[PDB]
Amino acid sequence: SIVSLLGIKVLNNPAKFTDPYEFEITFECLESLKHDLEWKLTYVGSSRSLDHDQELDSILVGPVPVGVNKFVFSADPPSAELIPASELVSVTVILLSCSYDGREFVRVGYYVNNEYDEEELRENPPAKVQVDHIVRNILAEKPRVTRFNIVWD
């Protein structure tokens, strides 16, 4: 494995639902590589239909710097218009993954709590969801890390 993820900091947390996601990513690259890394943030909604995922954003790194490297990935927020109203205040998942030359080799998942700003809203949620009052809390202390063996160069 030529690249390994060493660490993720979930920087702006808790955040508003519509705030971008700012993660500091630390990775190590052991040797020169021919192709790009692609880091990707995927929203995994609580909707039951198969389209419940959103690729939120992605960032390419290339040519890959050798050694230990630290950078910030700023990912666009979810498209609320693509999320059923009943699923905006809900427990959901975000996945940060990385691929090399299109081949995924690491994925980090987090559960995400989503609740209203104020008590009166939490106890009497309106039928029309007020997305501007929803606060997300990425449960950053409990990442689920999965690695996949891939061919590099």
Partner: antibody
Framework: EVQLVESGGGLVQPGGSLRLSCAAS????????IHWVRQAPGKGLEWVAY????????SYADSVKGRFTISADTSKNTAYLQMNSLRAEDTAVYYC????????????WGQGTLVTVVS | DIQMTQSPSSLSASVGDRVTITCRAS??????VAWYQQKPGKAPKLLIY???SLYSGVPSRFSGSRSGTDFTLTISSLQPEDFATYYC?????????FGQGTKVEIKR
């Protein structure tokens, strides 16, 4: 209406300490990052440190890490830069700045406070 | 040790000129580049973020572009209030880094 009001500058002995503060108003610092950026006399901008008050995560420039500590009191909507073991080369105007939804660009800047390290 | 190499150090222009300022990142940056204006005795003001996004309230004659590691600020038609110093910034790689600045001065 967004304010970033700094305080704490002044003349200080080499090896001494100063605490700078940055009192924010018109936005919740919890959802932003707060940065310090300094400008030596007649020179350009040099990033110093940032904090995300929500998480407490911070970052420091190489030349100040271990000497400077950035912190935030969200209940007071205020950030702080504790500057220890000050050196001649720390003389500069120190700006407080806010980043929010701009991929760590700074969209609001305070007016700056001058730190002069002199014996 | 990422560098933002800003050129030129200064340039002279007239009102109405098209002005371009370039900042070359020493390694690839996807989008987190910003441009600032600073006038003597004043704090910097944000113009462009995310390489090409116009910050709210900034005049449309300001634009930003990315060409590989070249990041460019363009003022399509210089106005009198645009004589100032301009800084680029990258904020993808640790540490946040500014370019050395470009002073836009008045031709006579």
């Amino acid at each position: 209406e967004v304010q970033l009001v700094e305080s704490g500058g002044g003349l200080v002995q080499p090896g001494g300490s100063l605490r700078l503060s940055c009192a924010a108003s018109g936005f919740n610092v919890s959802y932003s990052s707060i940065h310090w950026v300094r400008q030596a006399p007649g020179k350009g901008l040099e990033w110093v440190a940032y904090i995300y008050p929500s998480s407490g995560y911070t970052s420091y420039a190489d030349s100040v890490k271990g000497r400077f500590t950035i912190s935030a009191d969200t209940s007071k909507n205020t950030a702080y830069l504790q500057m220890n073991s000050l050196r001649a080369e720390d003389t500069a105007v120190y700006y407080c700045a806010r980043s929010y939804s701009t991929k760590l660009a700074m969209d609001y800047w305070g007016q700056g406070t001058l730190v002069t390290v002199v014996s | 040790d990422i560098q933002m190499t800003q050129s030129p150090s200064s340039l002279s222009a007239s009102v109405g000129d098209r002005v371009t300022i370039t900042c070359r990142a020493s390694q690839s940056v996807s989008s987190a580049v910003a441009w600032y204006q600073q006038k003597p005795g004043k704090a910097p003001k944000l113009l462009i973020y995310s390489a090409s996004s116009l910050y709210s309230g900034v005049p449309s004659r300001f634009s930003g572009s990315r060409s590989g590691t070249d990041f460019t600020l363009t003022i399509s038609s210089l106005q009198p209030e645009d004589f100032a110093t301009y800084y680029c910034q990258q904020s993808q790689w640790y540490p946040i880094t500014f370019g050395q600045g470009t002073k836009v001065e008045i031709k006579r």
